[PDB]
């Protein structure tokens, strides 16, 4: 059956301020999707048609620079995946000569080195996010309105975002992570009772490492599920309140930035949760196979 | 007094990492309540009686140092409150000689200076929170357990917290802020239609300022409401899940830190939301009075 982690896309990291989260899946920042959404907003205002060039030059380059940064950490990624494959697979551990304690410490060191690399190589890209944001605000000032800025475009997009939000079975995600977190706790509780009786070298270490990784991925799923829930609740609360006809231009700037980043979060968190969904299912199959091996060793002991 | 804000406790500020929130209400940080909760956890484990002294000395002193640090910003607070009372009250504006544009600018400068003071004077205290947290983690290592650490105390406290969580009407908080936010947006829209019809600049400026402050306080209410709901949902999710009877010592450490900080967030946010609820209501009374003064002027040509 399944016993080898082929993909470790589940690692992410946030910056020190916890404003930006870096993912191994492109566009790597949710903020790229906001720049894509503003391209849709700007097409309805002829006063800001220059953003078409800002998007082609600044926004696309930022995406590729983010992809380039992730690619710089690719050899750390392969080294980390090589350690994971040994630590999770007793058969692969038996083909080398290092001890499990040594490989475990190298795993923690390479894990933080890889995650640290994802952030460090993207710091200048993070600064570019603010500069393109400020460039967008300055571009928005060229609108031919000041205290009577129309909100039709703003309210048209909220309605469009609400139907896209219905295309995500939010109850399925809650039910899935609830069962998995309890299945995870039951697994660890079963391992605790078995270890109290026997020492099963290699096999028992492997199943604990996989469970430890499972716990990390569970935490990642809950994080990204909380953000997509928050984003949908905010946009929905706007649609259930009063709808002003006209606002000032500085207010319309905040409006576009508000719904634009919320839809970006939703779009970004969806593909992240889908990846994390597959990673959890994959880790569980490894645990299942290892657990059957562990019960066989328990029988021959007693 | 009529159209007079007497309390400006609604201002708060977070640190750059957004891990610590500094409030003008004692204990100024929710982390103090966690230290108070661990004092209850430690009473069930004779191996860690030393925390009785750590709490009495380090924790209480941190509270008093936090209170003193906030006190350093009192001169800025009085200046800021003085500007608020002028900007919100047309009668008090007419009794002085500064222009409304200059007073608005001084407000924005003093507001940021006061909020920045609340954080800057508390930076050493924020570091002391980390010292006490690490000292607690090191103290927990003295437990006479390794792979068989009982979770009886952990589950006894979760039961207690759930009873306390039900004493907070979350739906009342939600229904209030959503109706209040809608009334706020209607007030703004009403002024946009009204100001086109009359030249009442003194009154209109005061309404716009009070509504400007109302917007800030609404965002504060929403921030603290989200935190307290997250904390209740996390602790409730623990109760609805599998309940292992024994865990490892490092797992028990994270157990105590998890529910302790979540309950601390619950206690802290409740008193914050109650203060913000009163502040929003008081700002709305000022808007009601000013709208009544505005409609009176509209009647007389």
Residue numbers in the entry:
A (entry chain B): 28 to 329
B (entry chain A): 28 to 328
What does the paper say about this structure?
We designed six variants with the standard phylogenetic strategy (encoding 20–37 mutations from WT; designs WHT2476–WHT2481) and three with the ProteinMPNN-based PSSMs that exhibited fewer mutations (17–26; designs WHT2482, WHT2483, and WHT2484). To determine whether the designs retained the structure of the parental protein, we determined the crystal structures of WHT2483 and WHT2484 (19 and 26 mutations, respectively) to 2.4 Å and 1.9 Å resolution, respectively. The best, bearing 19 core mutations relative to PvRBP2b, expressed 16-fold greater amounts (up to 11 mg/l), and had 14 °C higher thermal tolerance than the parental protein. After the three-step purification process, WHT2482, WHT2483, and WHT2484 showed increased protein yields up to 9-, 16-, and 10-fold, respectively, compared to parental PvRBP2b169-470. WHT2482, WHT2483, and WHT2484 had final yields up to 6, 11, and 7 mg/l of E. coli culture, respectively, compared to 0.7 mg per liter for the parental protein. The main surface change is the reduction in positive charge in a patch on both WHT2483 and WHT2484 compared to the parental construct due to the introduction of the charge-swap mutation Arg418Glu. This is reflected in the overall reduction in the calculated pI from 9.2 for parent to 8.9 and 8.8 for WHT2483 and WHT2484, respectively. Comparison of the binding footprints of the human antibody panel with the mutations introduced in WHT2483 and WHT2484 reveals that the binding surfaces are largely conserved, with few of the introduced mutations being within the antibody bound surface of parental PvRBP2b169-470. There are three introduced mutations which fall within the antibody binding footprints, these are Lys248Leu and Met324Phe which are present in WHT2484, as well as Gln378Leu which is present in both WHT2483 and WHT2484. The interaction of 241242 with Gln378 is mediated through the peptide backbone which would remain unchanged in the stabilized designs. Our results show that WHT2482, WHT2483, and WHT2484 bound all nine human antibodies with affinity in the low nanomolar range.
